[PDB]
Amino acid sequence: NKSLVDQMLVELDKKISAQMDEILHNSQFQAMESAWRGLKLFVDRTDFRENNKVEILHVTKDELLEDFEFAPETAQSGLYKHVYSAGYGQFGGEPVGAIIGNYAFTPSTPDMKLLQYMGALGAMAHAPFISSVGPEFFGIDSFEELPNIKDLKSTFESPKYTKWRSLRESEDARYLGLTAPRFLLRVPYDPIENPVKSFNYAENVSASHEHYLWGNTAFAFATRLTDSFAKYRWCPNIIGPQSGGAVEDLPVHVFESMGALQSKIPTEVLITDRKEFELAEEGFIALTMRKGSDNAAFFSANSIQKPKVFPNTKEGKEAETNYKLGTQLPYMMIINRLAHYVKVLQREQIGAWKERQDLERELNSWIKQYVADQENPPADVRSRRPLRAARIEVMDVEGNPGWYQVSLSVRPHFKYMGANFELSLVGRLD
Amino acid sequence: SKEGSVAPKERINIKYIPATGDAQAEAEVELPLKTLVVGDFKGHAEQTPLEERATVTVDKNNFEAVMRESELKITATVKNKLTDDENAELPVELNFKSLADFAPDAVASQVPELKKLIELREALVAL
Numbered sequence: 239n240k241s242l243v244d245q246m247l248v249e250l251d252k253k254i255s256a257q258m259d260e261i262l263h264n265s266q267f268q269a270m271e272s273a274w275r276g277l278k279l280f281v282d283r284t285d286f287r288e289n290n291k292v293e294i295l296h297v298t299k300d301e302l303l304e305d306f307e308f309a310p311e312t313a314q315s316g317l318y319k320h321v322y323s324a325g326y327g328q329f330g331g332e333p334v335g336a337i338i339g340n341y342a343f344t345p346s347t348p349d350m351k352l353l354q355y356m357g358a359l360g361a362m363a364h365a366p367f368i369s370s371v372g373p374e375f376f377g378i379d380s381f382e383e384l385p386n387i388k389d390l391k392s393t394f395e396s397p398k399y400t401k402w403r404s405l406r407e408s409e410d411a412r413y414l415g416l417t418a419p420r421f422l423l424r425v426p427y428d429p430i431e432n433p434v435k436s437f438n439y440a441e442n443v444s445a446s447h448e449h450y451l452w453g454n455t456a457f458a459f460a461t462r463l464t465d466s467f468a469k470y471r472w473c474p475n476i477i478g479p480q481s482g483g484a485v486e487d488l489p490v491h492v493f494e495s496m497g498a499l500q501s502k503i504p505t506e507v508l509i510t511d512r513k514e515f516e517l518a519e520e521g522f523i524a525l526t527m528r529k530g531s532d533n534a535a536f537f538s539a540n541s542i543q544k545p546k547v548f549p550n551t552k553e554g555k556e557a558e559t560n561y562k563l564g565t566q567l568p569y570m571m572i573i574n575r576l577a578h579y580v581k582v583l584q585r586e587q588i589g590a591w592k593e594r595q596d597l598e599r600e601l602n603s604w605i606k607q608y609v610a611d612q613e614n615p616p617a618d619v620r621s622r623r624p625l626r627a628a629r630i631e632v633m634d635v636e637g638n639p640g641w642y643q644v645s646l647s648v649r650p651h652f653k654y655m656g657a658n659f660e661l662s663l664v665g666r667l668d
Numbered sequence: 669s670k671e672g673s674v675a676p677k678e679r680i681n682i683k684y685i686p687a688t689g690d691a692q693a694e695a696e697v698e699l700p701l702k703t704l705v706v707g708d709f710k711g712h713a714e715q716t717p718l719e720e721r722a723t724v725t726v727d728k729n730n731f732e733a734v735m736r737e738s739e740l741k742i743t744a745t746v747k748n749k750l751t752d753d754e755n756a757e758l759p760v761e762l763n764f765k766s767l768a769d770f771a772p773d774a775v776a777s778q779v780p781e782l783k784k785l786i787e788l789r790e791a792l793v794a795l
Contacts, residue, residue, distance in 0.1 A: 253750055253785065254776065257746075257748070257749050257750060258782070260758075261779065264744060267742055267744070274709070274735065277726075278767060286727045289698055290700060292702075292705055293723040295706050295721070297708075300713070302718075305717075305718045316719035325702070332699055336703050337703070338703055339706055339707065340708065340709075341707060437786060463703070578699055586694060600692055
């Protein structure tokens with residue numbers, strides 16, 4: 239008698255769980271749940287008692303494009319008034335440090351026009367834009383074939399991507415960063431592992447991995463920016479397993495394979511290191527899973543802009559050196575914070591009796607705050623005093639009195655991003 | 669005022685200044701790294717133009733208040749699997765207030781075609 243009642247309970251739980259699998263896998267519901275649950279995943283990992291503010295503006299892509307095209311230029315849109323005019327260029331306001339896009343980008347002409355314009359907004363407002371590369375940007379179905387694509391550098395020469403290669407060469411691609419693959423937000427449900435109240439639910443996730451809740455990567459990258467700022471009052475430390483870029487605590491899902499157990503990877507794939515360096519050369523931020531752990535890391539945080547090739551002379555290698563310093567985000571965050579302090583502090587001196595050498599003296603004594611030029615500073619003093627040299631030239635705008643013209647050039651600490659090793663056995667060595 | 673004040677001048681004028689005398693010293697607040705998270709956060713397009721809708725400050729201390737005031741909504745259609753018919757669809761109409769509302773408990777409460785089965789399960793368990 240009782241066992242028949244329990245069999246009716248098992249069949250009824252199959253019915254309610256069978257419907258609940260259909261509601262929770264709804265695509266719009268995955269968009270809402272992914273955006274908000276991923277948003278709390280960004281929020282609680284930061285530290286708001288160290289002067290960080292995160293603001294929310296509900297915008298879908300179609301009204302960024304309809305907005306920017308409805309705007310007569312970039313300089314009168316809505317988002318330019320929420321970022322620039324209410325912030326950076328307002329008397330007494332606060333600058334926008336970074337912009338995180340909870341989007342996914344395709345090679346469609348609306349998306350690349352969107353990134354041209356957000357390159358412009360990032361230009362006039364000094365805010366890097368971070369977003370996600372969608373699965374069809376590489377020409378494939380979903381991210382679980384990055385071990386199956388033979389070559390990315392020869393993939394991107396197709397005429398499908400002509401607008402994209404027109405985008406990397408633009409001078410505003412310092413301010414964009416598009417991130418490679420997504421990661422899990424939520425352990426799939428189970429009676430034991432992540433239970434539900436007053437019901438027996440067992441989430442039957444199939445072989446198709448869209449049934450997981452995938453969150454955006456750009457939130458995790460934003461946790462690395464805001465946490466690095468909370469520790470060190472700057473953001474150059476986002477690029478390592480130990481230098482600061484380590485994103486810890488990702489959810490696992492141990493599920494039964496063909497006879498054995500295996501861990502479902504928290505990112506969609508285990509990107510091998512050759513594949514990571516290729517994604518780094520293409521201007522993507524590869525969230526790399528550490529195999530056998532539940533931890534992930536950014537081995538690289540390049541931006542979009544194609545690193546130029548100059549002739550192999552002395553001056554050519556200096557100009558290439560400067561041009562590859564310019565195109566990586568852990569240095570553009572240094573220049574963003576200097577641009578913000580220079581704007582905000584150098585509005586408070588309008589109206590002081592200044593000469594030319596006054597600006598040389600006050601900017602040089604201003605920037606000796608941020609110079610760490612000893613013999614061998616440890617990692618922390620390099621972390622909070624990022625730039626090693628500063629050379630400031632102050633000149634007058636001739637025939638327009640008072641107006642001073644300043645070139646502020648910095649040389650940051652180089653962070654260790656690759657080496658080649660050659661080993662050799664030998665006798666006779668000292 | 670900002671310079672303080674003094675008495676009218678006497679034989680012995682005593683006033684206190686910040687006696688550090690720190691020329692080439694100016695004050696700045698440590699500027700906040702104000703991250704502007706922009707993404708699809710509601711289930712629909714809003715007719716309100718982009719310059720007029722406002723930013724929402726979010727911290728840890730009012731995130732449930734932010735999701736509360738946001739008035740979230742999803743109105744959609746799913747495939748209905750309480751029977752053996754393909755054409756049978758289940759319309760859902762949900763309301764969301766915090767991150768508890770994405771669990772299968774509250775979703776099980778907000779669709780009556782499942783809520784009656786949860787209560788009927790509570791009839792079969794109690795016997």
